[PDB]
Amino acid sequence: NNLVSTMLGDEDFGIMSGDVFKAFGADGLVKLLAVDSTTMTLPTYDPLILAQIH
Amino acid sequence: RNDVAWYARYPHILEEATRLPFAYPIGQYYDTGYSVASATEWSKYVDTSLTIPGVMCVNFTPTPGESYNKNSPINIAAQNVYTYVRHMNSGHANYEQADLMMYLLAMDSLYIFHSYVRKILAISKLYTPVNKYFPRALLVALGVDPEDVFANQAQWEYFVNMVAYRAGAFAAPASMTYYERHAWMSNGLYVDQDVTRAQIYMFKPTMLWKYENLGTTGTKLVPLMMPKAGDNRKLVDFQVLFNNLVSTMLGDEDFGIMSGDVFKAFGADGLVKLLAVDSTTMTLPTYDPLILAQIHSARAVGAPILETSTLTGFPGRQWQITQNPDVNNGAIIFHPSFGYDGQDHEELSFRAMCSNMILNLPGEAHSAEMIIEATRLATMFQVKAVPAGDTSKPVLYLPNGFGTEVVNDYTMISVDKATPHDLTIHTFFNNILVPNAKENYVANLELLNNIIQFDWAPQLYLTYGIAQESFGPFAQLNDWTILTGETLARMHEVCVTSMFDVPQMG
Amino acid sequence: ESTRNDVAWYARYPHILEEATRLPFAYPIGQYYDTGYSVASATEWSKYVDTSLTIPGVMCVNFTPTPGESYNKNSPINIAAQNVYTYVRHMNSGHANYEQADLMMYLLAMDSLYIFHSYVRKILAISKLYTPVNKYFPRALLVALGVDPEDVFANQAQWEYFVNMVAYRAGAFAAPASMTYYERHAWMSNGLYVDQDVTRAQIYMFKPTMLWKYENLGTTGTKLVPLMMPKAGDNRKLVDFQVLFNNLVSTMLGDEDFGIMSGDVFKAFGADGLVKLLAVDSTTMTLPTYDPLILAQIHSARAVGAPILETSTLTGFPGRQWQITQNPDVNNGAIIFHPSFGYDGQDHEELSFRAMCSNMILNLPGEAHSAEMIIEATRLATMFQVKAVPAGDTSKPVLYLPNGFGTEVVNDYTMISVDKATPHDLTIHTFFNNILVPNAKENYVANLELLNNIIQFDWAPQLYLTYGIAQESFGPFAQLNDWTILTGETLARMHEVCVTSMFDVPQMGFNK
Amino acid sequence: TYVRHMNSGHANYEQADLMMYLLAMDSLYIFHSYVRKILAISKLYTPVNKYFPRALLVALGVDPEDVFANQAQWEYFVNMVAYRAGAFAAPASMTYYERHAWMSNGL
Amino acid sequence: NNLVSTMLGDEDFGIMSGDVFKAFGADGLVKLLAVDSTTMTLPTYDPLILAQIH
Amino acid sequence: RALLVALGVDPEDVFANQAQWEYFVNMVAYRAGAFAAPASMTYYERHAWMSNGL
Amino acid sequence: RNDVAWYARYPHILEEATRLPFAYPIGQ
């Protein structure tokens, strides 16, 4: 609530959000992931992550 | 041995001894008579009366759902609908997001008024010999003089058709299920059971929202009180209420600009459609188990506070949806105080609503849609409103959240057991005070027996004057649960979000 | 679903709907539940906020087995006595040392033995019922029948073998199996009945208030006097029920006329035509069933009050004790059972019995009603007809004479619930259909609590509530569906039909 | 997680209240197995083994004449223990209960 | 009796019993089977029991 | 539990209040997902790659 | 015009209002 206090129900942020929606189409926006009791992530092996952690 | 039964050896004896008249018409007083003929010496100790009620009207008020700041669900909804309308109406628009949302709320109050007068018109056709409450008790519960509707049928039909023609000239999105929900509640007759001598549930708006654009300090939706049951209001009063409702919208330039913008954004197949009415138009009482489940868990919040309300110690607590641009960063604001009963005193029955509610359902398996529809008319108090002053006669409460409508009252219409056996109007909350007088205990018992005739009737919380003690939920429970304010607030915050929802542009 | 289509936000956001509406719905009944406060500062209003929630579990209907208002020779029990004496004595070559009413009072004394066996085998079968979803089982049912629930636990083998030995000693007497009188009283008093066929359902029972104890006179005749059964708070052990059975069959096993009549009924009806009380074992459990006829007659049940004993003191009514008598010198040698109703157990007027002096309402489920449904729904209904005339100048109680009653009458009802105050133990409330509420502040919320406990039961008896502050009664406190006003002659005709049907024997040659 | 969250359970207890309830149920099951072993032992008589059943009954801590003279009361007490244990619920697929029953019921 | 004393009157045990009952069903619960007059245990040979006794 | 301690959350709160946590994260996705952002920017995709992977 | 009778439009009302017990036993 401290993060989105100045954005939820705000007119200027809604104007900018609608403009990004019209410029980049709905298939070209970011998609947040839903979560249920089925949702779990498994530890994967990524050598690109390890090289920049190093 | 023969081993044939006695009832099979003489079936005529059994069929003659058990021929009884059933299906007594309701709407009619019945005297049972005496089994001990000498018992007329006991005057009131022998109750020979039998009155069946027919109408319980749920008196409601449409709300946006407890706006405190700009992060409210109605302000997020205003943002989304203004982004949709603005990026479909390429050009120069002067209104804000909140002017558009307040236009949408005033449109909702218009649609509720149109379905209200259309229900007044469509009830008056209803006749059946086995229910004598049709149609006069349903018209008394809606606050109209029933003889005025019969004597002036063409003027009434013209008035409701012109309400549909005028109020139907402003566009509103039918993708919002808010309007569809109020149309579902506000022009339907609902039986408590799927029988012919069933009892009728109705929804009548207690108040509606009048637009009231003022000065430069935004807009401010103010209450417009509807006729209460027992008022014999005529067509001229409903015409005055209509003209008071659309005084600031008919032939207005800004409302026409917003209406044309909603028309261009949401197409003509995606707007709401008001229903026409003729002499052929009539509504029949249907069986809807979704209506009964939320009538069951309904909790009445009290009377709306107006400017002319004289709350001692509570100034400025009148119910109003405000849009001041210098206050709360120009956010739509609505947070009413509850527990007002029309008078300037304490109303100690509202203390009985300070416990956790019971959510009761039929069956043993409950769907999530079923659970969330059964909680739509429920409203639990959370804290007490702070008295500003030295003394305070009333006690007000603040909820944790409420849905798209709150219940104000219920009105039960039954027949009088004394001659000439005319209708009786009883208005009550979920809470009921019984003060210490002899004329209150048997009357309260009559009212409780009248309420338990209604199948999924709201749960009662009685209190007694000399006992200083409230009794809990007077209702038959089947498969219940105890709700807290946070769970119901989560459900309210979900349902206010779902009702004001529009799609995207792609 | 009239005009509501959907919201369609719940379909594309079903997970938010799922974790927004995740509630527990299956509370085990049998214990107290505190709701809590919505407004947390409402503890300053002590009793003005009700946070208590008590569901009741058991309503026991306390009944008396009756022959059905015999006051002359044209009674149904006297016509049945003439039929059974014609079949046993004349159609089969029977003995000639007894009369037509001796047989019928023997056959009425056998029904008390059968009701006693059904009662103790219900006590035995209840004590093995334990459920997580119902914490009333089995202690509330055992308390409502009047036993110590720990005595049936700690002496289960002695209880079971006592039930079996009662069924074995009942074989020394003979009674015909095709009398549906015995079958009806057994089917009523053996059985737990749910009110709406759910998991956490409410339970209806039938317990005898009293039984008929056979008293042998000289040449004066033959009587059947009440033997009182234990009430719902008595905590009676096995020794009390053994004493009750031993003075129930005391004057029966040593009587020579009962031996002659037992051998006569045995050789008239055969061995396979007799009533057999079947033996139970360690795996015999009763279960709660759903019977809409039982609920139909519980709903239209009218209590008649306490039985009048010979030790009962009633000013102005000296000789009104309940008894099935027979004197060959009095009333042409007819069986006479003509009881006064409206007794509450005290020497004063139960002021609420005035509210039972209006015509009853026969309420039924559905919209179509069979003849058998109407004849079964009126079985426990008993309307008053006239005041009994008091002897002398003054009289404290007010007694009532009916216009016919069925093959059993209801004396009262007993409801078992949990207490709303700590330690939330079981509470026993005994009440008639009429309930008096005296002018005192402690009785109003008590009566309202009793009303809310009663409306939990589905086909509950209709109540009549007299308020002493108002000098006024309110009528039938019930939800009505498809009802009719019933007068005394209609109920009398239905009672005559059922008592004639209950005492009929189809084993006989009567209308082959 | 399974009782409270996967099935819609009540929220007035915690994760350790459930497990201590389920641990208290095992003592009831061990007690029923113990008294039914006491009951089943007392009917074992063999010519080739004169320890039966008095040594087994002494080793369990009972009076071997009390189980003889009160056999019906002992059996119906075992059955009533199994009947009153049905007032509480515990899952059958925990092999904890099955192991303790299989150990304490058996010679 | 003092094993089940604090168990049958406890309200939390009643709630937890109903919860385990509705979660695991009725056939998923532990049933202590009833004995009768002809139920005799017999000595058996189990080499796992001897393996853990040793 | 170690992965929850490293993220700064009381682990028992996530187990005891699983439905409230699921509702909170789904409403964060519903609210924050109402503002558009370009998925052609691989900045968001990189932070999503780093920030919800084990 | 419809010209159907009231008793043919609501026969259930007529059959419910006239269900009376007859054939009372004599001797009583």
Q: Are B116 and B202 in contact (CB under 8 A)?
A: no
Identify whether G21 is preceded by a cis peptide bond (ω within 30 of 0). Answer: no
CB contact under 8 Å between E19 and D6, yes or no, is no
CA of residue C187 relative to chain centroid, distance = 12
Residue G11: C-alpha distances to residues B284, B307, G17, G18 (Å): 21, 57, 10, 11
CA-CA distance, B374 to B362, in Å (whole number)?
11
In order, the DSSP letters of B374-405 are TTSS---EEEEPPP-SS--SS--EEES---SE
Dihedral pair phi/psi, residue D64, rounded to 5°: -70, -15
CA-CA distance, C322 to C396, in Å (whole number)?
19
CB contact under 8 Å between G22 and B19, yes or no, is yes
Q: Does B497 touch chain A (CB under 8 A)?
A: no
Q: Does B3 touch chain C (CB under 8 A)?
A: yes
B317 dihedral zone (left: phi>0; alpha: psi -120 to 50; beta):
alpha
Identify whether C423 is preceded by a cis peptide bond (ω within 30 of 0). Answer: yes
Copy the structure tokens of residue C296.
């139909």
Cited resolution, angstroms:
2.8
CA-CA distance, F38 to F28, in Å (whole number)?
19
CB contact under 8 Å between A34 and C18, yes or no, is no
Q: Does B195 touch chain G (CB under 8 A)?
A: no
Residues of chain B contacting residue G12, judged by C-beta atoms under 8 Å apart = 23
CA-CA distance, C494 to D14, in Å (whole number)?
59
CA-CA distance, D76 to D61, in Å (whole number)?
20
Residue of E nearest to C30 (CA): E14
Burial (CB count within 10 angstroms: exposed 0-12, middle 13-18, buried 19+), residue B283: middle
CB contact under 8 Å between C24 and E19, yes or no, is yes
**Residue C232, min C-alpha distance to chain A (Å):** 50
**Residue C127, min C-alpha distance to chain D (Å):** 9
Question: Which 3 state secondary structure label does DSSP give B12?
Answer: helix
Choose among B97, B505, B506: nearest Cβ to A14: B97
List all residues of chain B from 88 to 147 with a beta carbon under 8 Å from chain G.
129-130
CA-CA distance, D41 to D106, in Å (whole number)?
10
Dihedral pair phi/psi, residue C331, rounded to 5°: 60, 40
CA-CA distance, B81 to C102, in Å (whole number)?
92
CA-CA distance, C85 to C259, in Å (whole number)?
16
CB contact under 8 Å between B76 and F31, yes or no, is yes
Q: Which of B202, B229, B191 is nearest to B456 (CA)?
A: B191
CB pairs under 8 A between D and F: 8
Q: Does C31 touch chain E (CB under 8 A)?
A: yes
C384 dihedral zone (left: phi>0; alpha: psi -120 to 50; beta):
beta
Residues of chain A contacting residue F54, judged by C-beta atoms under 8 Å apart = 41-44
SS3 content of chain A, % helix, strand, coil (to 5): 45, 0, 55
CA-CA distance, B105 to B100, in Å (whole number)?
9
Residue of B nearest to A12 (CA): B79
CA of residue B35 relative to chain centroid, distance = 43
Residues of chain C contacting residue E34, judged by C-beta atoms under 8 Å apart = 282-283
CA-CA distance, B319 to B330, in Å (whole number)?
18
Choose among C24, C31, C282: nearest Cβ to E14: C31
CA-CA distance, C202 to B476, in Å (whole number)?
12
How large is the greatest C-alpha to C-alpha distance in chain E, in angstroms? Answer: 44
Residue of B nearest to A5 (CA): B71
Q: Which of B365, B439, B162 is nearest to B276 (CA)?
A: B162
In order, the DSSP letters of C205-263 are EEEESEEEEEEE-SSS-EEEEEEEPP-TT--B-HHHHHHHHHHHSHHHHS-HHHHHHHH
Q: Are D91 and E24 in contact (CB under 8 A)?
A: yes
Question: Residue type at C316?
Answer: G
CB contact under 8 Å between B19 and G16, yes or no, is no
Q: Does E36 touch chain C (CB under 8 A)?
A: yes
Beta bridge partners of C466: C436, C473
Q: Does A53 touch chain F (CB under 8 A)?
A: no
Residues of chain D contacting residue F18, judged by C-beta atoms under 8 Å apart = 1, 5
Copy the structure tokens of residue C355.
């509210």
Angle at CA C339, nearest 5°, toward C69 and C100?
45
Tokens 């309307």 found at: C383
Q: What is the Cβ-side half-sphere exposure of residue G19, based on CA atoms within 13 angstroms?
A: 20
Question: Residue type at B394?
Answer: P
CB contact under 8 Å between D82 and E34, yes or no, is yes
Copy the structure tokens of residue C244.
């009750």
**Residue C485, min C-alpha distance to chain G (Å):** 12
Q: Does D84 touch chain C (CB under 8 A)?
A: yes
How many Cβ atoms from other residues are within 10 Å of residue B290's Cβ? Answer: 17
Residue of D nearest to C156 (CA): D76
Chains G and E touch (3+ CB pairs under 8 A): no
Q: Does F18 touch chain D (CB under 8 A)?
A: yes
Residues of chain F contacting residue B76, judged by C-beta atoms under 8 Å apart = 31, 34
Angle at CA C125, nearest 5°, toward C122 and C128?
145
CB contact under 8 Å between C372 and B38, yes or no, is no
In order, the DSSP letters of C113-181 are HHHHHHHHHHHHHHTT---SSBTTTTHHHHHHTTB-HHHHHHTHHHHHHHHHHHHHHGGGS--BTT-HH
CB contact under 8 Å between C49 and B470, yes or no, is yes
Q: What length is written for chain G?
A: 28
Q: What is the Cβ-side half-sphere exposure of residue D29, based on CA atoms within 13 angstroms?
A: 27
Residues of chain F contacting residue B80, judged by C-beta atoms under 8 Å apart = 34
CB contact under 8 Å between C282 and E17, yes or no, is no
CB contact under 8 Å between G21 and C493, yes or no, is yes
Residue of G nearest to B129 (CA): G13
CA-CA distance, C56 to B46, in Å (whole number)?
29
CB pairs under 8 A between B and F: 5
Question: Residue type at B90?
Answer: S
Burial C338-360 (b: 16+ CB within 10 A, else e): bbbbbbbbeeeebbbbbbbbbbb
Burial B412-431 (b: 16+ CB within 10 A, else e): bbbbebeeeeebbbbebbbb
Q: Which of C279, C244, C261 is nearest to C168 (CA)?
A: C279
CB pairs under 8 A between C and F: 15
Choose among A4, A20, A44: nearest Cβ to F31: A4
- Three-state helix/strand/coil letters over E1-54: CCCCHHHHCCHHHHHHHHHHHHHHCCCCECCCCCCCCCCCCCCCCCHHHHHHHC
CA-CA distance, C232 to C480, in Å (whole number)?
30
Give all strands (DSSP E) within C432-481, no chain letters.
Answer: 434-437, 463-467, 472-477
Q: Are B332 and B73 in contact (CB under 8 A)?
A: no
H helix count then E strand count, chain A: 2, 0
Q: Does C18 touch chain A (CB under 8 A)?
A: yes
Q: Does B40 touch chain C (CB under 8 A)?
A: no
Sign for the CA dihedral angle at E38, E41, E42, E45 comes to: positive
Q: Going by C-beta distance under 8 Å and a sequence separation of 6 or more, which residues neighbour residue C271?
A: none
Q: Which of D82, D85, E31, D21 is nearest to C132 (CA)?
A: D85
Beta bridge partners of B200: B55, B191
Q: Which chains touch G (3 or more CB pairs under 8 A)?
A: B, C
CB contact under 8 Å between C18 and A35, yes or no, is no
Dihedral pair phi/psi, residue B466, rounded to 5°: -85, -20
How many Cβ atoms from other residues are within 10 Å of residue D57's Cβ? Answer: 21
Residues of chain F contacting residue A41, judged by C-beta atoms under 8 Å apart = 52-54
Copy the structure tokens of residue C441.
């502040």
How many Cβ atoms from other residues are within 10 Å of residue B233's Cβ? Answer: 18
Q: Does D72 touch chain C (CB under 8 A)?
A: yes
Residues of chain F contacting residue B490, judged by C-beta atoms under 8 Å apart = 23
Angle at CA B372, nearest 5°, toward B368 and B374?
115
CA-CA distance, B359 to B479, in Å (whole number)?
8
Q: Which of C141, C54, C58 is nearest to C422 (CA)?
A: C54
Which spans in D7-107 are helix H? 15-41, 54-59, 64-69, 71-84, 95-104
CB contact under 8 Å between F34 and B76, yes or no, is yes
Copy the structure tokens of residue C463.
């109540």
Provide the edge-to-edge strand list for the sheet that holds B220-225: B207-210, B220-225, B321-322
Burial B202-225 (b: 16+ CB within 10 A, else e): bbbbbbbbbbebeeeebbbbbbbe
Q: Does A18 touch chain F (CB under 8 A)?
A: yes
CB pairs under 8 A between C and E: 26
Question: Which 3 state secondary structure label does DSSP give C477?
Answer: strand
Copy the structure tokens of residue D3.
């009782």
Q: Does A34 touch chain C (CB under 8 A)?
A: yes
Q: Which of B413, B395, B378 is nearest to B123 (CA)?
A: B413
Choose among G13, G17, G21: nearest Cβ to B19: G21
